Amino acid sequence: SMTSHSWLCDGRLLCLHDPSNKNNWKIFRECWKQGQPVLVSGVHKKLKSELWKPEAFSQEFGDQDVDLVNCRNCAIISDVKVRDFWDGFEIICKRLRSEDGQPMVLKLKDWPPGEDFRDMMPTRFEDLMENLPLPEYTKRDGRLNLASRLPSYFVRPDLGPKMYNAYGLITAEDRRVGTTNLHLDVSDAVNVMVYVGIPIGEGAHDEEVLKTIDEGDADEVTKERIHDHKEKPGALWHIYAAKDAEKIRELLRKVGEEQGQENPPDHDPIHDQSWYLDQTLRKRLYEEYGVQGWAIVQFLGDAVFIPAGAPHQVHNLYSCIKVAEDFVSPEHVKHCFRLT
Template sequence: MVGKKRAKRTDLCRFQGFRCFSLRDHEIVVAFDEAITVTTGSRLPPIWNRSCDLAELRQLQGRLAPFLLKLLQAELEHEAKPDLIRRCRDPDIRDTCDYCWTLLFSAGWMCQHCGWEVCNECLCLLPSNSEKPEHQCLSRTGLYHTLPDFVPISRFAPGEVEQLILDIETMLHNIPPSCPFTVTPSIATAMQRADSNREIISIPHNELTNDLFVHLWARDDPYPLVVTPIPGRKLLQYPWTPEFFTNITGKTGCEAQDCETGDIVSTTVGDFYSLFGKEYDNRQVLRLKDYPSSELFQTTRPYSDLHPDLMNATPVSDYIRQDGCLNAASYFPRGAAKSDLGPKMYSALRDRNSIGSTRLHMDVAPAFNVLAYADSQGGANWKIFARKDADLLAAWMRKRYKIKGHPVHQQQIYLTDNNLVDLRKETQIHPYTIDQRQNQIVLIPPGCPHQVSNQVDCIKAAADFLLPDHLEHCLRLTTEFREENLVEGPWMVDVLQVKLTVLHAYVNIREQCMGLERSDLSSAANLEDYSMVIDDAQNPQQVYHSIPSSPGQFSTFQDPDSSTPSDLQDEDTMDKVMALQDTLQSNSSSAKSAYSGGIVIQQTKAEKNRENRERKKANKIMKCVTKSNEPFRCPWCSAMHQCSADILRHINTSHAFKKALSNTQAKSLKRAHQDELVEKLKDLSIP
């Protein structure tokens, strides 16, 4: 239903924005209204770790495009279904299937009666599971959902999918081939040992470059890596010790989990960390459960001070930092629906009796994990299986353990040394073994089963990221997690949202590429114009008393230190400029004196007033033409554009206007100077 605008938007009504209630014979008739085609603009991060050049962005876009093209082609088939309803995206609402909890990329099916929305896969389950309690229609007591109850839903605007497909297909034909990369002999030897004997590849922090990282991970079976700190250089600037956390948040309540039984124990941060370094019989192997949360880590001091400290410690920061310019997840708009990729802290006591600090599991996204604190000279022992061995490992575990669901995804097993010996005998597979020390970083590819046993009391910090070369496998894991949600109800939320993440990344990178291309064209055009400037035109008075012979020559009257904004290059605007200058030239000639048959024609008062009005109009337009070379700045983020039309388009797509601009407002904003435009946009838009 359509209601008043709320201060904080929540998904309280599934029909918000496109369903209305009408009256017929004093009875309420429920029906679908016309689709809303205006989508909510994205809100990009304020800044990335560095600026990428056009070639880098095009390469990144090309690595994302094939994956996105498959999604859009499937979406196009869905949009062809009859009775399609279009919904707007809301950056503060995470649209998920009400049955399997998986993200709804765009396509969905909604019950016309109660608003229950499911994905394409779950819709196919209705005929065989229509009597399940969770399939009951909420608005009709005792009745269950059937296929005729559902209408197709899309979250794309009309024509948007076709335009994106066309853009991708065109772009893929113009992507230059990447340069071949050759590894050093030492790295080549390490790769051979990793393949044959599962020996871990260890690389110093300053030697792991972007190209080397991609070479090691952009393969069907990527290598887990250990990144060692640079000798003599401090990796983390904050102490990250039990005493540090006790001093700043010691009295804060939290929950600890028993790693053996799974039981939850209520405690405080100080009481938990007071157990570090103490040994006594029958001590529980406890770990802090979800504290601090990712939100607390990023928004609330003192943990928010640790967030940049952790990000500054990352290797290959372009890919791993959460604001990394080559991290596809960094382009997801800010909002409550943003993917939850950390960072998170993992504080746990020393393992005993091979209980395991973290049971065997797989991550849906690539992850980095730094051991920030170890109680003594020990550390954390990792067992990481190769991605290609994951299916064989799962099959072996199904035979050995009675687990409902996927034996790895359910996270119920920790493989002891004896278990690993049996596994190798029966399947010939064995894991990589890592003894992680303080300030060492472990990089884990998605889809690699792994488990951790703390040899001493440890504090670790971790975060996920998204490498363009792992998209297909991330999607496969998302599908496997969806199937786990169908075993015994909701089990795991789709935190990565890989489909929507790639869509946002592609669209926003495309916008940056277009801006850079326009900037290059504008710079080239200005250089050409400057060479045509004549000395007389540098006199401001001559701007108003010279008639250009054609609209294309109008730029010769601009100040050599300024550039003509591209939004004045359209034919309509230039015609108005020329008409005003023609009128002004005519009036100026009359104002001085004009001889006709030897008689001086005096200017009337009305003519003087008309000339003043025309001169003011010309001054206003020339004020736009002679704008400075400074770019147009966005008031909400670091975006820079060469003309006012581009910054208005950026505000509309990356932020949002409080209300739709009228034609008069749009024209006024386009003519405004840079500083003036920033102030106006602050009043008219929101971040």
């Protein structure tokens, strides 16, 4: 039967089932006030699916110049055509190759660039902004979004949305690397999975995806979304409570020292955005510092709500298109204040 919601992460994560229900705030707001992330499923069924295909992005924008990152080693590939990224999104035999002759796992850096999403893609902007869940929080002018209402004493978010495009990580060695490294934002954000590309050529790659989710510490109910409902998994997230940020900084200073980095005792490993917490570092964070996170698998059409100040990292299981919007909820406005 259809239900308002369910629980993931053994009861620690709210999952709302109906992205447009006017009642969602009645369940959403107690979880949000406690500093928890929230998941909303089914946003893909509200969107115009033809606007979110990699082939259309290549056809319409393919001649623009961009940089890419190699996700395996962080090397920058400077000044290539955006079609060189899109045409390899799902077809492995079209991907740029590293010197070892392997196809590369690539991330498209800063595209569309800065605040230009709305100007470059006005029909995509309309389709997304009209279908965001919890609209009193997430719309630029929503009644519970203080972004446009705050003085300079607060760090205000840039005009969004922002698009995040990257290939899926593939091998056993790829399990220890991030698509986006551990970091925190001073605003709240909603991140929507608008497209998941399951590739072909090296197509039969279903089992390393399961071992990644398993080793990622995903709950049994999350694993049933694959096996029972056949939904498409895009990305594995780890998110940590804002209150646990300094304990995470202490772990990464200790590990940085063990690994022979030479770092002043006050430097900020989270702001550096240079770490991915693999199975080993997550277990150590738990055992030695008493810190537990939320392991979240974001499927096609899932919206992930990330609280201000919450450290988080992202690991693409397949090729993903994500679109994110920043907002300032009254619950978390303390995290963007410029004094004390």
